[PDB]
Amino acid sequence: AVQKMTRVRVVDNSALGSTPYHRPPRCIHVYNKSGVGKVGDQILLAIRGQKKKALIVGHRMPGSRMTPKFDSNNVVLIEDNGNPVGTRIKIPIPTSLRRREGEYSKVLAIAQNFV
Amino acid sequence: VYRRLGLGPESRIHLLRNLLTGLVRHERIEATWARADEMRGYAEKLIDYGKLGDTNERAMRMADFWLTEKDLIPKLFKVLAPRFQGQNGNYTRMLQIPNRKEQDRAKMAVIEYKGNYLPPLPLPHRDSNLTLLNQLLLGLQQDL
Amino acid sequence: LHSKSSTWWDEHLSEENLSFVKQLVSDENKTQLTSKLNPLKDEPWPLHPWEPGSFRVGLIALKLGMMPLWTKDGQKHAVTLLQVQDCHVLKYTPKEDHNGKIAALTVGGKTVSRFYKPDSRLEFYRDLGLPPKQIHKIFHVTDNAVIKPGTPLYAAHFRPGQYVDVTAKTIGKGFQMGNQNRTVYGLKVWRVNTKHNIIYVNGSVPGHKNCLVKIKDSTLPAYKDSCKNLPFPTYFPDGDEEELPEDLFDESVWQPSEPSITFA
Amino acid sequence: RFLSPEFIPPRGRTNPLKFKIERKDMLDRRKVLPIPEFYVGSILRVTTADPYASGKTSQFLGICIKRSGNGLGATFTLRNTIEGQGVEICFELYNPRIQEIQVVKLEKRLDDNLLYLRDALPEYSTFDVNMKPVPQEACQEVPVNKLKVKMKPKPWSKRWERPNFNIKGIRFDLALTEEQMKEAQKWNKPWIEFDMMREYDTSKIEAALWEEIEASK
Amino acid sequence: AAPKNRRTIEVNRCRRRNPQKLIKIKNNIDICPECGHLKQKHVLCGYCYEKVRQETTKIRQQIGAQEGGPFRAPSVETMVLYTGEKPSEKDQGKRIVERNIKRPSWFT
Numbered sequence A: 001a002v003q004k005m006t007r008v009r010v011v012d013n014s015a016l017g018s019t020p021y022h023r024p025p026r027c028i029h030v031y032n033k034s035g036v037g038k039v040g041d042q043i044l045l046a047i048r049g050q051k052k053k054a055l056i057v058g059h060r061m062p063g064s065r066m067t068p069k070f071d072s073n074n075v076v077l078i079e080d081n082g083n084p085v086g087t088r089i090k091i092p093i094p095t096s097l098r099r100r101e102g103e104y105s106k107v108l109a110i111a112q113n114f115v
Numbered sequence B: 001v002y003r004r005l006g007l008g009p010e011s012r013i014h015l016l017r018n019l020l021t022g023l024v025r026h027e028r029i030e031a032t033w034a035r036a037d038e039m040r041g042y043a044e045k046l047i048d049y050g051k052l053g054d055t056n057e058r059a060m061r062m063a064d065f066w067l068t069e070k071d072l073i074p075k076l077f078k079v080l081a082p083r084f085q086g087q088n089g090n091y092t093r094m095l096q097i098p099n100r101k102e103q104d105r106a107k108m109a110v111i112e113y114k115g116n117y118l119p120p121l122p123l124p125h126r127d128s129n130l131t132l133l134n135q136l137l138l139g140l141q142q143d144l
Numbered sequence C: 001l002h003s004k005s006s007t008w009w010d011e012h013l014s015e016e017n018l019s020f021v022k023q024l025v026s027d028e029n030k031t032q033l034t035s036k037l038n039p040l041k042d043e044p045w046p047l048h049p050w051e052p053g054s055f056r057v058g059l060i061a062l063k064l065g066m067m068p069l070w071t072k073d074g075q076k077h078a079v080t081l082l083q084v085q086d087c088h089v090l091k092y093t094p095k096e097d098h099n100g101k102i103a104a105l106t107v108g109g110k111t112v113s114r115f116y117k118p119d120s121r122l123e124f125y126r127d128l129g130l131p132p133k134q135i136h137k138i139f140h141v142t143d144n145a146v147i148k149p150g151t152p153l154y155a156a157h158f159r160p161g162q163y164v165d166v167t168a169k170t171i172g173k174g175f176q177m178g179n180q181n182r183t184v185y186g187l188k189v190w191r192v193n194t195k196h197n198i199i200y201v202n203g204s205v206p207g208h209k210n211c212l213v214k215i216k217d218s219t220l221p222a223y224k225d226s227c228k229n230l231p232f233p234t235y236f237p238d239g240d241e242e243e244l245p246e247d248l249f250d251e252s253v254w255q256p257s258e259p260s261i262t263f264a
Numbered sequence D: 001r002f003l004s005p006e007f008i009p010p011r012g013r014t015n016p017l018k019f020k021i022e023r024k025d026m027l028d029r030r031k032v033l034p035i036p037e038f039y040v041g042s043i044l045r046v047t048t049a050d051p052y053a054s055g056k057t058s059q060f061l062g063i064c065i066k067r068s069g070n071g072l073g074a075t076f077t078l079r080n081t082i083e084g085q086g087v088e089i090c091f092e093l094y095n096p097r098i099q100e101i102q103v104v105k106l107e108k109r110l111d112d113n114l115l116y117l118r119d120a121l122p123e124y125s126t127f128d129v130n131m132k133p134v135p136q137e138a139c140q141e142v143p144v145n146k147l148k149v150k151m152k153p154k155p156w157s158k159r160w161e162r163p164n165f166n167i168k169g170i171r172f173d174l175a176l177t178e179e180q181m182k183e184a185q186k187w188n189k190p191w192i193e194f195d196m197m198r199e200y201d202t203s204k205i206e207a208a209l210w211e212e213i214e215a216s217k
Numbered sequence E: 001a002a003p004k005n006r007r008t009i010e011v012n013r014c015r016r017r018n019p020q021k022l023i024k025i026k027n028n029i030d031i032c033p034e035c036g037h038l039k040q041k042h043v044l045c046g047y048c049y050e051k052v053r054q055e056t057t058k059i060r061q062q063i064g065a066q067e068g069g070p071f072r073a074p075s076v077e078t079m080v081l082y083t084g085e086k087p088s089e090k091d092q093g094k095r096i097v098e099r100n101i102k103r104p105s106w107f108t
């Protein structure tokens, strides 16, 4: 359940995300009609003093039955043009994003590990 | 499913422990109706623990805690448990007594262990079949 | 004192007579119900063919609870359980004498004990030849769909796949509330159990478990005339034109014992 | 005689008829899909139809950490760490989309609930997805793993040290001092273990269920 | 809180004489055949019950003297015997309480 604050982990090879930084990440905006951000929901993340759009791929909030509950909040950065900021994703990514309404093929085309 | 009694959850059990210990010692106790009803379930379940067996180690821990006076522990396994072996339940008889005339008008009841040596309580009696209405019902029963 | 005294049915009953009284009550209930089992064999009122604008009678059912139900698509749908108990037509009101627009039929279910009920209620039911029912409700029924009083009504009146409207009193919460009649509209029926007269209805229904509810055909404009393809007056087991399956399922519903669904 | 938890009804005012109907569906489904006997702590591999994928099934392996629900709606949760990510999946026993259920390793753990494994070290929770089934002895009890897991730093999801949780599979001594236990023990509520009002007996119900289940077979 | 003017006795008289505030009569009064005294239909007679408690206190007093010490509850069954009744073989293996009074008519 991504929401105000909610320390997150940037699962991407983007230069801003890849480089370690002292400041804990305070996510700003959730790109949904509702205020809660879950897997597959676009969000705005502040990394390295910059603002970049991110896509949630995992959360620690209890989920529906028959689904894996992640132990860490995982996100993937997406450019303004719609292409992912990073060319690779390391954490296992649920395959439900394909059926989820929206544009998720590009991110799935970047996710090596599927669970 | 539980009455809100005592200054805390411990007090209710301790108060129930005090009530349970007294009833076992005397086998007939007069108390407020609400308390008697609340503790009636515990007393019946305690008899089941006695029926479970004296050798049952768990029963001793329950009996030891609930019964402050330890002389009662042999009594439960050797008096109460043998007494109720035939019975499958209803070990305790609770009846309503007129409210205390102590200016607070508390609802009073008497709870006793069945099979006790104490004099029988004045229980209510249903109407005899010799009554006119019962005799009329008897005729209907015979015809059917 | 030459004054009134308070009495109950068991006050003057002896143990031997009390046991007999229970047996007698059971015998009366059995005999009365069996007598009313066959409506069509008891001089039924004339039944008319369906025409547009006809309205069928509703039923009263008990809310058993909710359980998960699965469809052939593999999705899980929570469904609420409604049981029709001792549903019988009691009193018919003429169109003019009740409402100029339409006539109404009174239906009562969930038989109740006779010991703690007023004699007036028992007197009416004695004429009807049925044991007293917990709730009396009025349903607007057209003249063509009128059914003779005392006709048993079963869950088979409704069929799987039909949307229905359920109205029931909401759970009361005390001073803080609730305990108000409310209606839920557009609930589809997933399955009906004929043997136990259990109807499986999509969604939740107001009220607590084991709470009586009123069930009537959906009044939404889209489902204006659904009774054309359904038993128009009602389903008569007495007629036995075709014995229905014990459990009625919707086509999408995945019956238990079917092969495991594979998403191909 | 192993009676699965779901068959046992809970105390309440619910109609017994509902359980009978629910059991019939459960028993009939069990013929279609075999539900092997397993306990919390057992590693299971479950085959399930994939809705997101088209005409593809998958198998997920994890240690059974918790069992919940009753009747047809009963579910079981098995945990594993995949690519370094702890994952717990709650599988409904009678869901038609479960193609097959395999108990790769039938065993029990110290506690009936293994949610504390999240706070334990990852290795205790790590299991190979491709691990082959290990041998089992039919005329024996399921092996009970008595290994005590080591916890991560004191901040945990839940205060397992409290008497309410009463976890026996945690190496509290290593991570907790005796004084901390006493602070936790302030919530002992010793009267609770001695209260007979919280006791519910299903032994008679469990015994009766066995014949009904076998009769249906 | 006081009303802006004194409440008239007429106004006050109506309030106190409203039926809602008056004392209600009870019709559940019953007679006890056992004591011949009044009782409620849901309440047991106290005149007879008083005898039981008084006898119980006397019986309890005899038991206390026989035990002779605190925490001396027997592990064996207990029985009460009155004058004119002597311990029998069936009474063996049971604590026996002896009462100077003869067997009460009500007690059996």
Ligand SMILES: [Zn+2]
Pocket: E032, E033, E034, E035, E036, E037, E045, E046, E047, E048, E049
């Ligand atoms: Zn008397």
